[PDB]
């Protein structure tokens, strides 16, 4: 149904486990979907 | 429903990983057997050249 | 559900049969702040939450 | 439970087993119908329930004319072979008496497509044991028209996958490896067709198909035969590996390519390496090395292939090779990027005998232009290579401009600047700019 926003909607923290082969394709389709915010995972590893 | 589906998908992914590992192990075993056949025959000839 | 359906559609598009399902992890951390907004409200909400 | 057992994915083979297991009235009803023997009925009673009675069961199956009953019996035997609770007994009952294996094989490879597939799977599992290889029986099975027809029918993806898996399993034993290639033309073109089509079951079909080709690629003589008689698929394998998604398929393809190009195989040092250069394999291998393959074995294979390609390219940088190529027609593109270029020693040698090599190249270009066949694709490629070499030589040796002008090379190049061949037109324009920009200044 509708998911309008007074102030926000209940959002979830979801973890992803994906195979190596389709990882790039999943990233591309997720980016062109654009709905999830990835929290920090390897910020310790410098650039 | 979703947690049961999540567990089923995790089991399926584990089974797929195990199957891929088994296939890789079988390919490695075949390649190792072929390499052993190739090298041992060459190594046997090298060691038996003096005997010949 | 929509995200999982899209991921499954992608997996069908690809040749890999390995599942890539996802599950919720309910942590104690503060969740982010999401505001759907039409063009009649986007600028309003942006100026308000500046 | 036996030395080894098949591990087919059975996307539809499992459904076939279930359908065969679905109908079971023929186990005992045929005996009441005076079809099967009473001893046959007793034997089939055990089959109905989920060491020595196998032989009368085989005899009843051979004598039985009801195709459904024979299919059910064969499915039960196959399940007993596959089942761990009876796998050891199933292996032993044929290992201790290998004579009946030939009769069992002759009983197989007949009936309906599903029935024939089940019987063939059972026969392959029986013949894949550690003992009793029975190479003659394997050759007879390969010569069977039913299995070959099933394999060739690429439309039935499930049946083709089952046949490919059975053939690949039957080729595990090196004793039957050579006999497999004895009828290579019967199946391999279909196998190479599967890889060409690619460029769950579909991914699995490619993996075993690549494995089947790789498995037969162990013998260096067979490797050379496959590289020569089917050079198209061998060349397209690089593109397939480049566009492959699963890491296993790419690793198998890289291993197959390396084995084909291995120095052990005869004529691999030169013919195979040149064929790789004939397929633009160097940039593809460079890109593959750039890509971060997950498998360490795949990375090592990629490194070895890159080293082999680099050695082949270095061997292709011989000024003698360039001279030999220029002596004949149909110039190749791998030398002229180094010899008429970074390998300035080749240019210095070409300078000798008052630009002898430059004069020969100009004569070849003038003959090609005067022939009037510039529209030909091969002639266009030859003209482009000649123009590139001439442009490279002109920059190194300005004195050749006078030779070109005296021989009419400048006028020929100017005329070729208007040629419709855009690929040749770019080279012609570059050569004209080099001649006018540097020498004419």
UniProtKB/Swiss-Prot annotation, chain C:
Cellular location(s): Vacuole membrane
Signal peptide: none
Posttranslational mods: Glycosylated.
Miscellaneous remark of the record: Present with 55714 molecules/cell in log phase SD medium.
Role according to the record: Subunit of the V0 complex of vacuolar(H+)-ATPase (V-ATPase), a multisubunit enzyme composed of a peripheral complex (V1) that hydrolyzes ATP and a membrane integral complex (V0) that translocates protons. V-ATPase is responsible for acidifying and maintaining the pH of intracellular compartments. Is present only in vacuolar V-ATPase complexes; enzymes containing this subunit have a 4-fold higher ratio of proton transport to ATP hydrolysis than complexes containing the Golgi/endosomal isoform and undergo reversible dissociation of V1 and V0 in response to glucose depletion.
The family this protein is said to belong to: Belongs to the V-ATPase 116 kDa subunit family.
Assembly and interaction partners: V-ATPase is a heteromultimeric enzyme composed of a peripheral catalytic V1 complex (components A to H) attached to an integral membrane V0 proton pore complex (components: a, c, c', c'', d, e, f and VOA1).
Name this polypeptide is given: V-type proton ATPase subunit a, vacuolar isoform
Species this chain originates from: Saccharomyces cerevisiae (strain ATCC 204508 / S288c) (Baker's yeast)
Full-protein residues shown: 347 to 396 of 840
UniProtKB/Swiss-Prot annotation, chain D:
Record InterPro entries: ARM-like (IPR011989), ARM-type_fold (IPR016024), ATPase_V1-cplx_hsu (IPR004908), ATPase_V1-cplx_hsu_C (IPR011987), ATPase_V1-cplx_hsu_C_sf (IPR038497)
Keyword annotations: Hydrogen ion transport, Ion transport, Membrane, Transport, Vacuole
Chief site of localization: membrane
Membrane topology type: Peripheral membrane protein
Subcellular location: Vacuole membrane
Entry GO CC: fungal-type vacuole membrane; Golgi membrane; proton-transporting V-type ATPase complex; vacuolar proton-transporting V-type ATPase complex; vacuolar proton-transporting V-type ATPase, V1 domain
Phenotype of the disrupted gene, per the record: Increases the ATPase activity of membrane-detached V-ATPase V1. Abolishes growth at pH 7.5 and in the presence of calcium chloride, abrogates growth at pH 5.0.
GO biological process terms held by the UniProt record: endosomal lumen acidification; Golgi lumen acidification; proton transmembrane transport; vacuolar acidification
GO MF terms, alphabetically ordered: proton-transporting ATPase activity, rotational mechanism
Lineage: superkingdom: Eukaryota
Misc. remarks from the entry: Present with 22500 molecules/cell in log phase SD medium.
Assembly with partners or alone: V-ATPase is a heteromultimeric enzyme composed of a peripheral catalytic V1 complex (components A to H) attached to an integral membrane V0 proton pore complex (components: a, c, c', c'', d, e, f and VOA1). Interacts with YND1.
Family note: Belongs to the V-ATPase H subunit family.
Biological role stated in the UniProt entry: Subunit of the V1 complex of vacuolar(H+)-ATPase (V-ATPase), a multisubunit enzyme composed of a peripheral complex (V1) that hydrolyzes ATP and a membrane integral complex (V0) that translocates protons. V-ATPase is responsible for acidifying and maintaining the pH of intracellular compartments. This subunit is essential for activity, but not assembly, of the enzyme complex. This subunit is also required for silencing the ATPase activity of V-ATPase when V1 is detached from V0.
Name by which UniProt lists this protein: V-type proton ATPase subunit H
Species of provenance: Saccharomyces cerevisiae (strain ATCC 204508 / S288c) (Baker's yeast)
Lineage of the species this protein comes from: Eukaryota, Fungi, Dikarya, Ascomycota, Saccharomycotina
Gene behind this protein: VMA13
